[PDB]
Ligand SMILES: *Cc1c(COP(=O)(O)O)cnc(C)c1O
């Protein structure tokens with residue numbers, strides 16, 4: 001039965017992990033996957049998380065199944081974090097949230113939901129973008145179209161090209177927007193641009209789908225959600241796939257959420273029942289631990305205070321490494337100017353390397369990055385920054 | 397976009413949870429979902445699990461993503477538990493295991509894998525059976541056919557009817573067998589019958605798929621895996637979806653495994669790469685906590701000893717409640733003899749109630765069971781047994 005199965009192609013992002021595993025060279029530098037590293041090159045468990053896990057260990061009395069949609073408190077806190085503590089969406093009970101195994105899992109649930117319950121046939125994603133998007137929607141049977149987004153020479157959002165591309169998207173089409181910290185460009189719309197996109201979306205009849213995996217890494221928790229909120233204010237329906245993998249450092253616990261919004265409470269409840277049906281035939285119910293940690297932290301004033309500071313520290317260390325990266329690059333002999341890196345939000349550096357240069361960085365210098373030229377700045381430390389820049393200058 | 401979505405039908409098993417939620421009557425009895433209850437009507441966290449979680453809290457230094465297939469140790473221990481510590485499948489590297497979000501999640505991964513990578517078009521499941529099977533495979537685009545299994549009057553496995561039904565299954569068809577503790581009948585093939593099925597399977601060219609969610613609840617860990625092992629000895633290829641939800645009381649942590657077996661190491665590795673591709677476009681990587689607990693317990697002699705005893709205690713309490721149930725039924729005036737219940741393995745009682753009787757038990761007595769007439773014996777306690785039997789006698 002399996003004699004003729006073909007070897008699947010490696011994942012352009014997750015496949016780096018396997019290569020790093022093989023390479024036995026002493027000082028290889030991992031700047032691939034978007035995971036936070038501290039000054040010591042370690043991906044630590046947040047202190048707030050350790051405290052929450054301590055609390056769970058002493059108070060948990062059962063591991064009996066959660067409902068299909070997960071921890072009710074978790075969904076409440078997620079909606080507040082997304083739409084604002086006193087939002088109308090919450091007051092009018094227009095939103096329902098299902099806890100999912102990571103943001104990726106949330107995207108898969110959204111995809112199965114749309115494919116089976118609506119007339120949607122196309123999903124629009126940005127280019128450059130995040131490869132997993134095309135893969136997930138395609139697997140659900142939806143075709144993926146791309147819309148321009150980046151001005152490769154000025155290193156800014158090409159708003160005009162964006163609007164021109166999206167004009168080809170018809171009513172009923174899904175349009176996927178990155179909530180903040182666009183992966184991989186790190187260039188996000190200004191509030192005024194978000195507002196224009198929100199209005200344009202309503203008029204064209206698009207169904208906005210937001211991928212929100214970096215809330216808090218651009219400017220702040222609330223500020224980073226202003227684009228989404230601009231949309232939520234004018235739209236009757238929308239979908240949000242969010243993740244706590246990065247802002248809580250809970251990567252491997254798979255903590256995400258798929259939030260569905262409808263015109264009214266009656267409609268969202270009917271639609272949500274179908275979303276639950278899509279979950280039932282997938283993994284049945286979500287994993288408790290990760291989400292339990294999140295709900296505990298977000299519902300406890302003390303733990304929340306600690307967590308918000310840790311998030312702020314992560315954001316600040318990254319922004320600090322960006323400056324050092326640029327500075328070290330100049331004092332190392334870089335013939336090209338990478339100052340444009342400073343404008344980029346999130347964990348990545350993007351736009352200055354070709355796929356050949358990335359290959360050479362790996363083969364000759366043991367430096368690992370994504371073929372698109374995306375480097376994880378969050379993986380840069382004061383210790384590996386010197387050899388890192390010397391290698392880059394060598395391939396420029 | 398969502399104006400015309402239809403309300404999804406409730407799940408015949410998981411939907412009971414919602415009804416129990418609504419019913420505000422004081423002493424309702426939950427005998428629905430197959431979850432273990434102790435003598436106090438509580439679903440406790442095993443002591444071995446608490447100890448493992450304690451260990452993780454103190455030694456975990458990161459929550460960085462696990463690989464697509466999960467914790468390597470977890471897969472090793474799962475293969476030993478299934479095929480035997482020194483099995484040839486393991487020696488010959490003919491098996492690969494992916495950690496999954498529960499046994500259900502494993503079934504979904506198996507389904508997506510088969511649908512996209514093989515010529516399989518049909519999956520055969522027993523009737524009576526477990527409703528989730530049809531739902532999951534159907535969602536993956538595979539048609540489900542049923543094969544006879546139960547002798548409703550003698551309350552035994554109708555081996556002849558089973559073989560007659562399966563004769564309609566053609567080479568290339570998948571045949572799903574419950575590893576032990578058949579849900580819901582509780583009637584399993586004897587070792588001799590398993591051996592006959594194993595031989596018949598090889599000759600007809602079926603691809604066996606085992607759903608193993610109750611290893612340890614029939615007779616014992618090793619004994620319960622003899623059927624699967626009989627198959628593994630004669631088959632070149634097979635699939636096993638196992639779960640740790642019940643034997644570890646880790647329900648909500650979603651701890652499962654999908655094991656793939658091929659003729660050789662080369663073939664299984666190629667096929668497994670495609671299974672990983674099916675996972676990547678679903679939830680990406682599995683949740684760490686639950687599986688970490690399992691690997692810690694199974695790899696530590698002391699913790700394992702404790703866990704095996706707790707499992708033995710659960711099995712024994714259930715078997716004890718079966719006797720009491722039958723006895724209390726007789727001394728309560730039951731006009732019918734339910735002694736056949738004693739032969740049934742696992743957590744359920746099946747075969748003596750109609751769907752109307754179950755409805756009346758709910759409406760009039762607050763007793764909840766599945767419409768098929770399946771009652772969770774593991775939910776019976778010395779405290780609720782009296783009112784439970786009085787209600788049953790009333791509807792007989
Ligand atoms: C990290 C990320 C996600 C979700 O990751 P999970 O690990 O599945 O929670 C989704 N989209 C983008 C663009 C991301 O960077």
Ligand SMILES: *Cc1c(COP(=O)(O)O)cnc(C)c1O
Nearest residue numbers: 498499500526579607609639641
């Ligand atoms: C419990 C069970 C499963 C798997 O349950 P999970 O909670 O998904 O691990 C699968 N099949 C049967 C027949 C079961 O009883």
